[PDB]
């Protein structure tokens, strides 16, 4: 089974700057023909793949010509020269010369821009989850870019990550910002136990982490 | 040329399942039809294949074993059965024609959906959230309104007849326990929330349920 690499997981490229993609492949796919079976596929999110190169270079009826691929032996690559946001998605390799034929890891292209900073927040549980016999914390982390961005609950100074519910939003549209919303749940007993809940969050713009607490005893 | 994929399905543990991808305006007999699975994480992977003019049948070494594929040349339909479902059972199945060495991947099926769980169809449990008792109020505040406690998918968050069409951020859907829940956050201003009125409307198309309930202001 030809193994077929991808890089770089993740392409953020600007909108008019050229992105090249890069695929390997564990063999040589040549075939006898005098042809290389490689196709390059697109998937956008909610939707089937869409097929956009085939046999290395020769480009699919109805796709702009801004796609371009090209290659050889083990080493092909897919260039978009002028990138816009209906190039947004999810781009797999293929290759269908030797059986079986085998998907590449995919590469998720997104779109660069300034540094937003976080907007965090924290709400408590509700009165009907303390009738129901529990606790629901949650913390919100809205429109924060770069993904680098990580979550850390200290109760009452003590480190707290099992039972972590971890929950992120992709690249949105509008202002194409990722958002975070881990949360976790306590039972009464333990929620009415500890004395101080904390949420901080660990960003790029601001190396300090941001601390968001509440106070059980309040 | 179009192919039809059956409808959503939803199976217990150690149950099978039969897909069907229907195929006209072609000749269905002549091309064969390779089946992907795609998990919600990530990733495509092909099942196999199987062309129905003849008999012949190929399945990934992951596969083997656990997806038989089975035509009917009467009806233009090509089935796959699914033995032994489990939890990493749960994708989304596509199905498309191929010709190898030739025409490739260029029309695919809507994708079928195949979640396995013993779960049932449970209502949802909407806990409307308010900030904080121990909260400042800025001039940009962002609303929340939470959803736990539903199966299965999907369910339309959103607000009063699309009262605030912009600034929402419906975060995707996760199982916390052996049920889905979700969230979302809208962001108003702290004049006009006071006066302007809107509602979480929270659906669950699968119960019949269309539940909407607002959050009081604190
Ligand atoms: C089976 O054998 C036939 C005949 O030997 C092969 O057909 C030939 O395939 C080559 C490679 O695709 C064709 O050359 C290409 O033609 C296209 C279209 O004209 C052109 O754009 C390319 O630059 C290249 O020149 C060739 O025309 C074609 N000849 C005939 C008579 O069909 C076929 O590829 C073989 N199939 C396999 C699976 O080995």
């Known amino acids: 089974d030809v193994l077929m690499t991808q890089t770089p997981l993740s392409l953020p490229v600007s909108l008019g700057d050229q992105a090249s993609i890069s695929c390997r492949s564990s063999?040589?796919?040549?075939?006898?023909?005098?042809?290389?079976?490689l196709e390059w596929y697109l998937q956008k999110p909610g939707q089937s793949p869409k097929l956009l190169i085939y046999?290395?270079?020769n480009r699919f009826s109805g796709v702009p010509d801004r796609f371009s691929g090209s290659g050889s032996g083990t080493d092909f690559t897919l260039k978009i020269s002028r990138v816009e946001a209906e190039d947004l998605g999810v781009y797999y390799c293929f290759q269908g010369s030797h059986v079986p034929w085998t998907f590449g890891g995919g590469t998720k292209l997104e779109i660069k821009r300034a540094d937003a900073a976080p907007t965090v927040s924290i709400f408590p549980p509700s009165s009907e989850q303390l009738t129901s016999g529990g606790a629901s914390v949650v913390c919100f982390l809205n429109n924060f870019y770069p993904k680098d961005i990580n979550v850390k609950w200290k109760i009452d100074g003590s480190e707290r990550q099992n039972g972590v519910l971890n929950s992120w939003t992709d690249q949105d549209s509008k202002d194409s910002t990722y958002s975070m919303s881990s949360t976790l749940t306590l039972t009464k007993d333990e929620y009415e136990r500890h004395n101080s809940y904390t949420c901080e969050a660990t960003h790029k713009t601001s190396t300090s982490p941001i601390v968001k607490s509440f106070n059980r005893n309040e | 040329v179009q192919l039809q994929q059956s409808g959503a399905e939803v199976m217990k543990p150690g149950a099978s399942v039969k897909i069907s991808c229907k195929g006209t305006?072609?000749?269905?007999?002549?091309?064969?039809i390779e089946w992907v699975k795609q998990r919600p994480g990530h990733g495509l992977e092909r099942i196999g294949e199987?062309?129905?003019?003849?008999?012949?049948?190929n399945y990934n070494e992951k596969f083997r074993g656990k997806a038989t594929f089975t035509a009917d040349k009467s009806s233009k339909t090509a089935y796959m059965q699914l033995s032994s479902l489990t939890s990493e059972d749960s994708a989304v199945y596509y199905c498309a024609r191929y010709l190898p060495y030739y025409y490739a991947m260029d029309y695919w099926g809507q994708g079928t959906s195949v979640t396995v769980s013993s779960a049932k169809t449970t209502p949802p449990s909407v806990y409307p959230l308010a900030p904080g008792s121990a909260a400042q109020t800025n001039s940009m505040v962002t609303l929340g309104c939470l959803v736990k406690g539903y199966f299965p998918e999907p369910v339309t968050v959103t607000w009063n007849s699309g009262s605030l069409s912009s600034g929402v951020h419906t975060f995707p859907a996760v199982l916390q326990s052996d049920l889905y829940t979700l969230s979302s956050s809208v962001t108003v201003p702290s004049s006009t929330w006071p006066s302007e009125t809107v509602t979480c409307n929270v659906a669950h198309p699968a119960s019949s349920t269309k539940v909407d309930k607002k959050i009081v202001p604190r």
């Open positions: 199987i062309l129905p003019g003849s008999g012949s049948t």
């Open positions: 305006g072609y000749t269905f007999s002549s091309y064969w």
């Open positions: 063999q040589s796919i040549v075939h006898s023909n005098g042809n290389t079976y």
């Open positions: 046999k290395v270079s």
